[PDB]
Each structure stands twice: as structure tokens, then as C-alpha cells.
Amino acid sequence: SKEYHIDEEVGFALPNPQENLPDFYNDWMFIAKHLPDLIESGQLRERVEKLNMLSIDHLTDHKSQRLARLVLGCITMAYVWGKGHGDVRKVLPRNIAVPYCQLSKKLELPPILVYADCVLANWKKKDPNKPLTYENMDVLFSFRDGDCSKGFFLVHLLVEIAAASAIKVIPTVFKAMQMQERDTLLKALLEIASCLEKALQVFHQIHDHVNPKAFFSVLRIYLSGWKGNPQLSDGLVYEGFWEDPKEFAGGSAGQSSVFQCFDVLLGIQQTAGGGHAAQFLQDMRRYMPPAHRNFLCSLESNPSVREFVLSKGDAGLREAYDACVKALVSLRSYHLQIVTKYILIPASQQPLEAKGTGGTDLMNFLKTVRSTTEKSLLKEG
Ligand code: HEM
Ligand SMILES: N[C@@H](Cc1c[nH]c2ccccc12)C(=O)O
Ligand SMILES: [C-]#N
Secondary structure, three states: OOOOOEOOEOOOOOOOOOOOOHHHHHHHHHHHOHHHHHHHHHOOOHHOOOOOOOOOOOOOOHHHHHHHHHHHHHHHHHHOOOOOOHHHHHHHHEHHHHHHHHHHHHHOOOOOOHHHHHHHHOEEEEEOOOOOHHEEEEEEOOOOOOOHHHHHHHHHHHHHHHHHHHHHOHHHHHHHHOOOOOOHHHHHHHHHHHHHHHHHHHHHHHHHHHOHHHHHHHHHHHHHOOOEEEEOOOEEEEEOOOOEEOOOOOOOOOHOOHHHHHHHHOOOOOOOOOOHHHHHHHHHHHEEEEHHHHHHHHHOOOOOHHHHHOOOOOOOHHHHHHHHHHHHHHHHHHHHHHHHHHHEEEHHHHHOOOOOOOOOOOHHHHHHHHHHHHHHHHHOO
16 A cells, blocks of 8 residues: 555554644744634734745645645634634635645645544654554644644544554455455454454543533534535635635545445445435545545455355355444444534534534434445344
8 A cells, every 4th residue: 555655553644744844834834833822812814814925845745745734724724714703704815825725736635624634644643662542642733722622633543543453454355355265354354343343442532532512612613614604605715726716615534534445345335326425425535635535446446345245155254244334333323422422412502404514414414324334234144
């Protein structure tokens, strides 16, 4: 997975990303590192507006370009939403928007904060000699003081890392199929099941580091976007770059390649059907980095693991396949419990159906997606 850019240890996450840019972009780095203070003051909007258009040509390598997207992404969100109380801006300055739109065109991403920015690239190791764990880790950027953005983003990253153990087994599954190696295929599927079972235990940790009320009222508005959002109904206008206001979906873990990776592997056709959920999951691949878009493409091109397993009249092999599907159902069942605690209950406390940051009708969306996953269970062969 050299051309796919999937690490053995961290999977789809960017391994050890850059913390600081070259000196030419210190105007950017100063605004982004002090977003908690500059928003609370009410002087962030002016600070962005009175700032020269710095060009993008001095960002040499990929990790520099990704850190720039993160800086420019976080800044763009804090500008548009401002204090987050309702006073918004429907126009992004030409000095910030043009180089952001150019950098985003270079990396084949939309010019808006995505999962790849604020999770996969928004982290660091405290002590490099220690292991990957919450006490040894910290994010690079936050929005406000008491938004739980450290706990929020790192819990996602921890799941991505847990999934990396499963992702690295996928080449063995296809080799074992081509080579008609039944026992290897069985062991590989049981390993993937075990890794995805373990990723559920990493999910549990979100309660310890993320407060529901701090999440729903403070952080969630900055993660929101402008695709079918009433606050910016026709979209946001990027001054100088584009002519009309352009709609782009807000960030969400739907932009993660992990869950899509295993749905495709296991023949769970989420993106098939032409419904609103299928449409969303396919549309969110635009918001994944192009190497992972390519990985998911490569995965669909391979022979079906499901078809292979069903054809063989083999209880152990079916059971192993079923365990992977059960694991994905569990994670989604637990994800709905999280959604009850972190969206549903908090929204009932503030003074027809509820919209997610990605733009989905979330309760129907999520239960459709879970139901599709449930239907793929063999139910004792
Ligand atoms: C406070 C925590 C969380 C909330 C409130 C939440 C909420 C949601 C919502 C509303 C959606 C629907 C898409 C949208 O409209 O944006 C969604 C989708 C999704 N979420 Fe989360 N989520 C949370 C944490 C997580 C975590 C930790 C993961 C870890 C992998 C995750 C994985 C997903 C995935 C993969 C989808 C796409 C649908 C699917 O494949 O089942 N979410 N989430
Ligand atoms: N989609 C979630 C927000 C969210 C959850 N996990 C994320 C990861 C990255 C960006 C946004 C998110 C919501 O509507 O509340
Ligand atoms: C979760 N989006």
C-alpha cells in the first residue's frame, strides 16, 4: 500500500504529521493556533480580512500541504461561523479563499474542513518513544476552550489506528482466495473480526473525554458546512476563485475510509440502490484523499469475498465471514447509542427530522445503513 498511502500502524491516518509550517506562512499559523482566544475576543474576522494573499508555492512536500489545509480549514470554519451564535459570513475573503482553493485543487479535496484534515492530520505524539495512546497524544488545533476537541478528534484517530490492524490483513484475504487457501482465508477473516471487535472498545472511551453539552452546543457548529444548510442556503462564495456560491458538505466520520473499506470487502452494498444513504456514502468519497478513494476503487475491483464464502458449503468459513459482519453491526448499533447521547438528548434540552453535519437525515440514514449491514448476515449459513 505504497501508492494507497495506508500505514501498517495508523492505517488511513497521516503518520507523524508536521506541527509547524515554513516561516513564510507565520500569519496563518498564528491565527489557527489562537482560535480559542481570537473568536472569544470578536477580532478574528478582522484579523483574516486585514491579511495579504500568501501564495502556495513554498509548500514542498505532502505533509506541509496537509498542515496548510488544516490551518486554512480551521480558520475558514472559525471565520464563517464566528462566535457560533448565528452571526455568520456568506463571503470568504480573496486573500484566504484563493490559496485555500488552489491548495485544495492540488490535493483533489473540497475547500472545506474534512475528516482527513481535522482527525487524520490533526494530531501528534507527545513523547515519540512512548506508544500510541491518549495520555501520550494531543491535537494540533482547537476551536474554543471547553469544546472537548482533543478528546473528540483523538477518539476517532484511535479507532482509525485500531482499524489499521484489520486493514493490513486485506491483502491476505485476496491472496488466499486466488490461491484457493481455505485455512489462511479463515484465519484472516477471524483476525479482521477480532480487530473490529477491539475497535468497539476504543469507541467506548468517547464518554471519558467528550462532554455531550460541550460537543453539541460548542464544537458541532464549527464542524458544520454549507450543503443544504439554511444558514447559507445557496452556499458560500469564495471571493476571486469562483463566481457563484458553492455548496460543500460539513465534516463527518462518514468521510472515514474505514467503514466503507470493510463494507466493500465484505460485499455489503451500501453505495448501491440509488437511495439517499447510498448517494451520501458515494458523495463522501470526494471528501476522502485521492489515494483512499483509489484504495476503495481497487477493493471493489477484486473478486467478491461474500460470493467466494457462500459458494464453498463451509460452516467455519461462513462463521468467520459472519463475525466480521456482526462486528460492523455492533459498531453501528453502538454508534446509534452515541448519537442518542450526543445529539438527540442535547437537542431536546435546547430552546421535521434532525440534520447531521454531513447533511444527512441522520436517524433514518444511520438505521438504513445499519439495516443494510444486518441483511448481509448469513444467520447460520
Ligand atoms: C459525538 C460523537 C458522534 C456523533 C454525534 C456522530 C454522528 C453521526 C451522524 C449524525 C452521522 C450521519 C452522517 C452525517 O449527516 O454527518 C454519522 C455517520 C457516521 N459516523 Fe458518526 N458520530 C459520532 C462519532 C463517530 C465515531 C467515533 C465514529 C468512528 C469510526 C463514527 C463513524 C461514523 C461513520 C462511519 C458514519 C457514516 C455512516 C456509517 O457508515 O454507518 N462516528 N455520525
Ligand atoms: N456528523 C456529526 C459530527 C461529527 C462526528 N464525528 C466527526 C468527525 C469529524 C468531523 C465531524 C464529526 C454530527 O452531525 O454531529
Ligand atoms: C459521525 N459523523
